[PDB]
Amino acid sequence: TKFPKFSQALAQDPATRRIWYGLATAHDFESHDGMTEENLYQKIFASHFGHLAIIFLWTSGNLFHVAWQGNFEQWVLNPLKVKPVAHAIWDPHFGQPAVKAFTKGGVFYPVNIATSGVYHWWYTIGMRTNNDLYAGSLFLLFLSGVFLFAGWLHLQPKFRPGLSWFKNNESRLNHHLSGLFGFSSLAWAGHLIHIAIPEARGQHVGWDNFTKTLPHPAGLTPFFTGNWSLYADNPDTANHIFGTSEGSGSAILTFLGGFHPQTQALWLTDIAHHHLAIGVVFIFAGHMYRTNWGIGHSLKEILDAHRPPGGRLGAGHKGLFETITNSLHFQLGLALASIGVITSLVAQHMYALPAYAFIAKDYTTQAALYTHHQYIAGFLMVGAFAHGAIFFVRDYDPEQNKNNVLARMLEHKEAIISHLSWVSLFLGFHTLGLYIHNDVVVAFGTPEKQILVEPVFAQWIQASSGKALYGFDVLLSSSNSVATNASNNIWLPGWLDAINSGKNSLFLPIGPGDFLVHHAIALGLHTTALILVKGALDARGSKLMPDKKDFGYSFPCDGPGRGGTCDISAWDAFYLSMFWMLNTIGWVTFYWHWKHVTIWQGNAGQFNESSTYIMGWLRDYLWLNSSPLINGYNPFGMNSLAVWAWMFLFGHLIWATGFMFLISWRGYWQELIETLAWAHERTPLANLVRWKDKPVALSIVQARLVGLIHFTVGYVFTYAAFVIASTTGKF
Amino acid sequence: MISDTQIFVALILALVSLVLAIRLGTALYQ
Amino acid sequence: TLNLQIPSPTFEGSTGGWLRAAEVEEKYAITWTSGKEQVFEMPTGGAAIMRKGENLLYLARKEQCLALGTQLKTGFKITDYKIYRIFPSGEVQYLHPKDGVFPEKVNAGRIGVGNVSHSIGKNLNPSQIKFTNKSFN
Amino acid sequence: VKRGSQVRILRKESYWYQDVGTVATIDTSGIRYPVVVRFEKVSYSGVNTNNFSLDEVVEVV
Amino acid sequence: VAGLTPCKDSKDFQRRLDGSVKKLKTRLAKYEKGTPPALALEKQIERTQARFERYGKAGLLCGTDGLPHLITDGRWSHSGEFVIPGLFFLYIAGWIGWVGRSYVLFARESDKPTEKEIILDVPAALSFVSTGFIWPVSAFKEFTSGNLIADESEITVSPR
Amino acid sequence: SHAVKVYDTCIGCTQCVRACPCDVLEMVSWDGCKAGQIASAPRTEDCIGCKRCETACPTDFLSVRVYLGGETTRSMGLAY
Amino acid sequence: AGYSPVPSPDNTKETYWETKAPSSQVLGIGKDVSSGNYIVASVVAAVVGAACTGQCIPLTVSPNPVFILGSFLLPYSWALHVAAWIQRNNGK
Amino acid sequence: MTAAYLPSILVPLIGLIFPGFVMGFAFIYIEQE
Amino acid sequence: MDSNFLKYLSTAPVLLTVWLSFTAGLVIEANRFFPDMLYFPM
Numbered sequence A: 001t002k003f004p005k006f007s008q009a010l011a012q013d014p015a016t017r018r019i020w021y022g023l024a025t026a027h028d029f030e031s032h033d034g035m036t037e038e039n040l041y042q043k044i045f046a047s048h049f050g051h052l053a054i055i056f057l058w059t060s061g062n063l064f065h066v067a068w069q070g071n072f073e074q075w076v077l078n079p080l081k082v083k084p085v086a087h088a089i090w091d092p093h094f095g096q097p098a099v100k101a102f103t104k105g106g107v108f109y110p111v112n113i114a115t116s117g118v119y120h121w122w123y124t125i126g127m128r129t130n131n132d133l134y135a136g137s138l139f140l141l142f143l144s145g146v147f148l149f150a151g152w153l154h155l156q157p158k159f160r161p162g163l164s165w166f167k168n169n170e171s172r173l174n175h176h177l178s179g180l181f182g183f184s185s186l187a188w189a190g191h192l193i194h195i196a197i198p199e200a201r202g203q204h205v206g207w208d209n210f211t212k213t214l215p216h217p218a219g220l221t222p223f224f225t226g227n228w229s230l231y232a233d234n235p236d237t238a239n240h241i242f243g244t245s246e247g248s249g250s251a252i253l254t255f256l257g258g259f260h261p262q263t264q265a266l267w268l269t270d271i272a273h274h275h276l277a278i279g280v281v282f283i284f285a286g287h288m289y290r291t292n293w294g295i296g297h298s299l300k301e302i303l304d305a306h307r308p309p310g311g312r313l314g315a316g317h318k319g320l321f322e323t324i325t326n327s328l329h330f331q332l333g334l335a336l337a338s339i340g341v342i343t344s345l346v347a348q349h350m351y352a353l354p355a356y357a358f359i360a361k362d363y364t365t366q367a368a369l370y371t372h373h374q375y376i377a378g379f380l381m382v383g384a385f386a387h388g389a390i391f392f393v394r395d396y397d398p399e400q401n402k403n404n405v406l407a408r409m410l411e412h413k414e415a416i417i418s419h420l421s422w423v424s425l426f427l428g429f430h431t432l433g434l435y436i437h438n439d440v441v442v443a444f445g446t447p448e449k450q451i452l453v454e455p456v457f458a459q460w461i462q463a464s465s466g467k468a469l470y471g472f473d474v475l476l477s478s479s480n481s482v483a484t485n486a487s488n489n490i491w492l493p494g495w496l497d498a499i500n501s502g503k504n505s506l507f508l509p510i511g512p513g514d515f516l517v518h519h520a521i522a523l524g525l526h527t528t529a530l531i532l533v534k535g536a537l538d539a540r541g542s543k544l545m546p547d548k549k550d551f552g553y554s555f556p557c558d559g560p561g562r563g564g565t566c567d568i569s570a571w572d573a574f575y576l577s578m579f580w581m582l583n584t585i586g587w588v589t590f591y592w593h594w595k596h597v598t599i600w601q602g603n604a605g606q607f608n609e610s611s612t613y614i615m616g617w618l619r620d621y622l623w624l625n626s627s628p629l630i631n632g633y634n635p636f637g638m639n640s641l642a643v644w645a646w647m648f649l650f651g652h653l654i655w656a657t658g659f660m661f662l663i664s665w666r667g668y669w670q671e672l673i674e675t676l677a678w679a680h681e682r683t684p685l686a687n688l689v690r691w692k693d694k695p696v697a698l699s700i701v702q703a704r705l706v707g708l709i710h711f712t713v714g715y716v717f718t719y720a721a722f723v724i725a726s727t728t729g730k731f
Numbered sequence B: 001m002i003s004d005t006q007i008f009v010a011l012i013l014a015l016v017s018l019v020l021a022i023r024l025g026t027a028l029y030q
Numbered sequence C: 001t002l003n004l005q006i007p008s009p010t011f012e013g014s015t016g017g018w019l020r021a022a023e024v025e026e027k028y029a030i031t032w033t034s035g036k037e038q039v040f041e042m043p044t045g046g047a048a049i050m051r052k053g054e055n056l057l058y059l060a061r062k063e064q065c066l067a068l069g070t071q072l073k074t075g076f077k078i079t080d081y082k083i084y085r086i087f088p089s090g091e092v093q094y095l096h097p098k099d100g101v102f103p104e105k106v107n108a109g110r111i112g113v114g115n116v117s118h119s120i121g122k123n124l125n126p127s128q129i130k131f132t133n134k135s136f137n
Numbered sequence D: 001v002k003r004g005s006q007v008r009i010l011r012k013e014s015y016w017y018q019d020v021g022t023v024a025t026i027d028t029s030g031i032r033y034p035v036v037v038r039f040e041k042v043s044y045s046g047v048n049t050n051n052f053s054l055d056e057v058v059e060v061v
Numbered sequence E: 001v002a003g004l005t006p007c008k009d010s011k012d013f014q015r016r017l018d019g020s021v022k023k024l025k026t027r028l029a030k031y032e033k034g035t036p037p038a039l040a041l042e043k044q045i046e047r048t049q050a051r052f053e054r055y056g057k058a059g060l061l062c063g064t065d066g067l068p069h070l071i072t073d074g075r076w077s078h079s080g081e082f083v084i085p086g087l088f089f090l091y092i093a094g095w096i097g098w099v100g101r102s103y104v105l106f107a108r109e110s111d112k113p114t115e116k117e118i119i120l121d122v123p124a125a126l127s128f129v130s131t132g133f134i135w136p137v138s139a140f141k142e143f144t145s146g147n148l149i150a151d152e153s154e155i156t157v158s159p160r
Numbered sequence F: 001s002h003a004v005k006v007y008d009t010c011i012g013c014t015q016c017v018r019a020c021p022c023d024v025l026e027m028v029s030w031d032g033c034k035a036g037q038i039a040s041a042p043r044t045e046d047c048i049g050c051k052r053c054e055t056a057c058p059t060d061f062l063s064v065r066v067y068l069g070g071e072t073t074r075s076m077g078l079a080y
Numbered sequence G: 001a002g003y004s005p006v007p008s009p010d011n012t013k014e015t016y017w018e019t020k021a022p023s024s025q026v027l028g029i030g031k032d033v034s035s036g037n038y039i040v041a042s043v044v045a046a047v048v049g050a051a052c053t054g055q056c057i058p059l060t061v062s063p064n065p066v067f068i069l070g071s072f073l074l075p076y077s078w079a080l081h082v083a084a085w086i087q088r089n090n091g092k
Numbered sequence H: 001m002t003a004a005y006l007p008s009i010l011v012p013l014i015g016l017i018f019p020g021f022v023m024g025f026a027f028i029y030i031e032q033e
Numbered sequence I: 001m002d003s004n005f006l007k008y009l010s011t012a013p014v015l016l017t018v019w020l021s022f023t024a025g026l027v028i029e030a031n032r033f034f035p036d037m038l039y040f041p042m
């Protein structure tokens, strides 16, 4: 056969395993037949071009559908009253009741209401008409085309890059810091000053107007005179109606701090100043490394030079330059870990400090965004650790890493793993024990016997930032502090106004329930890290299979000898962490959603009192809030939430289906499929047809993967339904 | 508000991008 | 060589026997001499009666043939069992007692295949055999 | 090393690496792994004996 | 006082006490006086009142929920909430671990260590249980004499 | 097919050969072990990958290793 | 072992050290500067940076560009004194 | 011919025709010597 | 008493059950005479 053209070992398989494994190994270029390093890098380059094109097409489709089937123009008038519609529904399975139930957007056809916040995002950017969105979609289609053409072109013989080019670290770092990050954020500041702020003040400025419209009455004279403070004079009044000229100012760069009163989002002038500042900082940072001139550093020199003379790190960072440059898996792990941290940061900061107008009052949108980015964060972290393990299996050279930090990590992996295990057990034992103690006492009717620990440390941090709710008087809660006096005339007025009003999510008040759920989160993070770190460090070998690097990253097992060696691979560690990552992100999002739901209804006391025992979560969060969702459709009718109820049950179904692949293993199914093949061959009128691929059971690793995928899809879809439907049915 | 001519221009750009995507897919499959 | 005229152990039939893959790809056979008419267990399932004299049996897999041979050797005391593989072309080949003596005891003439000149700890690393044709040995 | 002596194992792949066993016999015929070491701790496979070379064992004090 | 109010002077705590006592009294109203159920419910009421009074006088702080909250930061005014209790734990746990380790070594130097670990030598086990009362100085003595920490070259480890 | 390999650690116990449900391992002559015999894997195309040979191996780290590779009808043990 | 050679910038030297101090090639353009020069530079930079920072601690809406520039000498003084120690133990 | 007809013209295509043709062609490709 | 019976009583599960029953009794009696101790009294 020639389906897995990249593997004859699969092309010669006489079973369906060939098809399955050709699917699942299509992108492991390194393992493909006759794969050279130049071909590997060039294929990755072209694939990156294709991926960028796909992203551009996806965003273009979003814009096009909001422009065509959307209510953006009638949403920019009363954004706090009109629900934003994502796209129209055309399903030939809908009944008249369903069509009517989904015509909620005042559009006269069934629609979906967007939960992505693109409406608020674009309105803040400066989009006002549907023609603006359509032009954006046209440009993004053009950009997808350009990047597809670039990907095709750079696979041509005279345009294929070389490895001396792919491994050029200094020039790529300089260009990515200076141009991709720095000048890109500078251009975003330019957009925010030339379009977004005038649009937020009711002055339309576009391609036909931006070359004659001054972003500031003084023009660029304050810039080219050193009188930069003239760009902060006359900010927008507190009575500014976003999108209109009533209450607007003339400042383009400010550091007011806090939130705009009407929009309850950060000041656009503050955002513009932020982007300009980080742009110049990144431009400076992108001039650090040596390129075709004499100025700059060399990362190899720095890494080799950094060795503490005490010798507590050994050879320090010698050889890491070659290790990282020659291992794409090391780079992949670093990038994935950093992007995961940054997307968790995006979730956290985007709720505590909303940047888009009126997004804070879109409760379902905020919850959906937070859950989305937290789940993405967890996936990225799991992937980073998985690719670290893959690097250890494939790209690690001990002789090159003779007694540097990496070899030392491997040296004391036992200490690392054992202490990680101890801290996991510590956290788990005691957090679960406190929860059970509270459960039992409250059950016996003695809630006064609960162990409720005030999160005084986090409360102290809040007070240091300027929260006066808790009486600490530390740094910014103190009016006579040097920290207060230093920033009293820049941002502290607005920042204090934001922190000390209970109308926002900035530094929400916390209590013993928050303490307990935080330590549950600590347990989850530590146990996921335990599984992943153990997998990575034992990937090359353990005492059970001391030659694991020979077998690779994702082999099924080593047989029933030596006591049994099920799940003895680093892939299995990934497979096992993914359960735990899902658990932990579930805990995180449960906490976020319940706290915010209680605050939104104003009964924060419900969380403060029921968060201390697990029955409180099971009753006052899940059972209580599932009512509208499970009533999406019922014997007495249906509403728009029927889709979310159906998807809730869908997630339950696929979750339980994954249980099948995770509990039932291969031999049973193989001995059953044998009987099935016998029956087919022996049945008249159906033995006229024969399989071209011998029907076999699924492999061990394949079954683990399929069960994990079903489990994950059920997890995600069940919670997505619950969160969106409950938020939309409660508010 | 979005006219059929506009939707048609969008479709033409989509078709061009599809052609380029097929080209890139071929070049990658090699 | 294999004589296709040897009688069979008067089996009563089963649904565990060979299938179309035996007629298309490979069909294994086992021949053995028995001193009396005993009852043995088919590797496919069920009981069969072996004859006094030579008995020929057809199976779909070499593992089935060798399991039957092990049963004969341990349960009974028959050790003259020979295993053959037959292709649709009529290319009957000889497999077990490959050299006429069972593999469990050394015999002069064999050549070592797959033997390595160190312990498993001396295997190279995939990083050392990456983008090269070297072998981890 | 001689018979009835405590020797620490230096083979990385070994279940008893950096662990002490008792030498039961040393074969002078010239085989690859002459020394035979007994251990009190059983391995995962259930064997408490192994054959080692003279360079993979160090006498303890 | 830290961020909360003393529980001895909180309307929420008083309301919780009142609710508990009223529940018990409603349960009691349906039982004859002097019967075992009446006596049991009366004792429950007395225990509830004593618990609430003792919590009030203990100096515990109570939040808006009306329940005592613990200040586990190190403040000496609230040591009895986490630190002294935790010192008692650490004492008992070090005792248990020290005596268990001593017994492991004692069984190690025996004819049949596995037999000693499944069928115990309870005279020696009780000996070690007794020894466990000065485990801190004993454990530090072991550490400094070098009998606690094993060398890196004498502990088995997997290949890299 | 699966790749079965033997190393110098072989002691000639022959239990790997006797444990194989197929006939993939055979004893050959050697001078590196007292028994004078070493395991060899001539018929590796009949290997199924059960690792019974690996189980029946008394040497610290196994003298016989089965590296599961490409799958065929015989490797997959498909009677159909 | 088949990995392509890693390209490094021009004039890339070996800076790895197990001596008491790095080789003074770590200091690049300032490799030939004297240890006394580094000491005086570090002291002057520390004083000037601290002064220019104090002149800007209660930041106004119109801070002085020269004070902003000079405040970056306090971080600079740290590297200067590290270089001073490196250059004292390398013979200079 | 207005844009309102495009959903009814396309959804059956993208959801029954494109998948059917893709599945048939991929079947022919995967099972092919 | 029979030494074999005493060894049986010295077996691990018997000792674990007896010791943990004794500890449970200790905790139960401590809570029976000094109940509702959420804190060390200071």
Ligand code: CLA
Pocket (backbone or CB within 6 Å): A023, A024, A025, A026, A027, A028, A029, A332, A336, A379, A380, A382, A383, A384, A386, A390, A553, A554, A571, A574, A709, A713
């Ligand atoms: C951008 C980042 C990135 C990149 C470039 C790579 C690249 C690679 N990864 Mg991956 N990886 C990533 C992120 C990334 N990974 C993340 C975030 C994780 C954590 C989840 C992993 C975890 C991971 C593992 C554990 C492994 C790889 C492997 C690989 C290599 C082979 C890919 C392969 O087999 O394709 C797979 C091809 C597919 C088509 C994927 C099929 C399954 C996906 C998940 C779809 C399931 C969803 C389903 C269709 C949705 C249904 C919807 C419902 C409504 C019906 C390749 C070098 C493998 C490798 O070669 O390692 C040596 C490997 O073992 N990666």
Ligand code: CLA
Pocket (backbone or CB within 6 Å): A092, A093, H011, H012, H013, H015, H016, H017, H018, H019, H020, H021
């Ligand atoms: C996403 C794409 C999609 C689309 C566009 C449709 C469309 C349709 N489905 Mg649905 N369906 C889908 C996915 C889809 N389905 C999936 C994924 C499933 C699996 C759960 C089902 C399961 C399903 C069932 C069980 C039934 C439908 C039915 C229907 C019909 C709606 C009700 C009606 O009154 O029509 C009915 C009126 C008609 C006049 C039908 C005419 C249909 C013509 C002949 C179609 C032309 C077929 C074409 C020539 C085949 C090309 C093959 C090629 C790709 C290889 C309609 C044809 C109902 C039906 O009646 O289907 C026949 C029905 O009973 N569907």
Ligand code: CLA
Pocket (backbone or CB within 6 Å): A421, A422, A424, A425, A426, A427, A428, A429, A432, A523, A527, A530, A531, A576, A577, A579, A580
């Ligand atoms: C609710 C289910 C559950 C529970 C309780 C645990 C518990 C544990 N898992 Mg996890 N795990 C789970 C589901 C669960 N797992 C699932 C579904 C998977 C996917 C396969 C995994 C996969 C997994 C892996 C891969 C790993 C863990 C680890 C751990 C430990 C984490 C540290 C900890 O919390 O220690 C605290 C301990 C507990 C919370 C359990 C104690 C239970 C009770 C309260 C103790 C008292 C017992 C009582 C006296 C018995 C009386 C009954 C008797 C009479 C019969 C711990 C043993 C890690 C580990 O072992 O690290 C050390 C680890 O590596 N788990």
Ligand code: CLA
Pocket (backbone or CB within 6 Å): A653, A656, A657, A658, A659, A660, A661, A663, A664, A668
């Ligand atoms: C909800 C979870 C779940 C599901 C769906 C199944 C499903 C199944 N199990 Mg079970 N199983 C489960 C959990 C589950 N299991 C768990 C947790 C375990 C571990 C203990 C097992 C262990 C196990 C064993 C050991 C065995 C089974 C068997 C079966 C089969 C029963 C008969 C059958 O085929 O019914 C068919 C019906 C369904 C699968 C229900 C869903 C199908 C819906 C109604 C139709 C949807 C089709 C749709 C149109 C497709 C469109 C695709 C596309 C257009 C979108 C079936 C495949 C037995 C078997 O296979 O015997 C025949 C068997 O031997 N299971």
Ligand code: CLA
Pocket (backbone or CB within 6 Å): A422, A423, A425, A426, A427, A429, A433, E082, E085, E086, E087, E089, E090, E093, E094, E096, E097, E098
């Ligand atoms: C009624 C309350 C209560 C209960 C039921 C438990 C129950 C438990 N605790 Mg304890 N604990 C409590 C209160 C309680 N704790 C309090 C108030 C504190 C704060 C001081 C702690 C602090 C604590 C720690 C620090 C640890 C536990 C651990 C445990 C678990 C195992 C203990 C063990 O095996 O001991 C038998 C004793 C041993 C096996 C010997 C070794 C372990 C002990 C604890 C060492 C003690 C001495 C050592 C020098 C202390 C250094 C601590 C430092 C590194 C922080 C067990 C579930 C252990 C755990 O979860 O491990 C995963 C553990 O390490 N607890």
Ligand code: CLA
Pocket (backbone or CB within 6 Å): A053, A054, A055, A057, A058, A059, A060, A061, A062, A064, A087, A088, A089, A090, B007, B010, B011, B014, H006, H007, H008, H010, H011, H014
């Ligand atoms: C990737 C973004 C994206 C997504 C997810 C969707 C989704 C949808 N579009 Mg489409 N659409 C898009 C971009 C997108 N569109 C763009 C850019 C245009 C302008 C040319 C259109 C124009 C358009 C029209 C005119 C209509 C839809 C309709 C629909 C719906 C049914 C599918 C259909 O008929 O497609 C048909 C799509 C086309 C004929 C052209 C666009 C195809 C895009 C560019 C494909 C991009 C593929 C992606 C980048 C990579 C695939 C990944 C791979 C793993 C599968 C559905 C909600 C129909 C509907 O019923 O809406 C309610 C409908 O009438 N779309």
Ligand SMILES: CC1=CCCC(C)(C)[C@H]1/C=C/C(C)=C/C=C/C(C)=C/C=C/C=C(C)/C=C/C=C(C)/C=C/C1=C(C)CCCC1(C)C
Pocket (backbone or CB within 6 Å): A329, A330, A332, A333, A334, A337, A341, A381, A384, A385, A387, A388, A389, A391, A392, A533, A536
């Ligand atoms: C700046 C500031 C503001 C407010 C006050 C505050 C005190 C917070 C102060 C300081 C903040 C600081 C110091 C924040 C610290 C954050 C840090 C250190 C975050 C780091 C997170 C680390 C992560 C994920 C690591 C993940 C690691 C992974 C995958 C490793 C994978 C790997 C493996 C397993 C094998 C080798 C290869 C590779 C890729 C390395």
Ligand SMILES: CC1=CCCC(C)(C)[C@H]1/C=C/C(C)=C/C=C/C(C)=C/C=C/C=C(C)/C=C/C=C(C)/C=C/C1=C(C)CCCC1(C)C
Pocket (backbone or CB within 6 Å): A050, A051, A053, A054, A057, B007, B008, B009, B011, B012, B014, B015, B017, B018, B020, B021, B022, B024, B025, B028
């Ligand atoms: C509208 C109009 C006006 C007047 C004249 C005209 C006849 C043209 C008439 C009709 C126009 C028609 C019928 C247009 C049709 C539009 C069509 C077919 C649009 C579809 C566009 C599809 C697109 C982008 C798909 C993008 C897919 C991508 C990147 C896939 C990425 C990739 C994947 C998934 C695998 C690896 C390779 C690669 C390329 C990286």
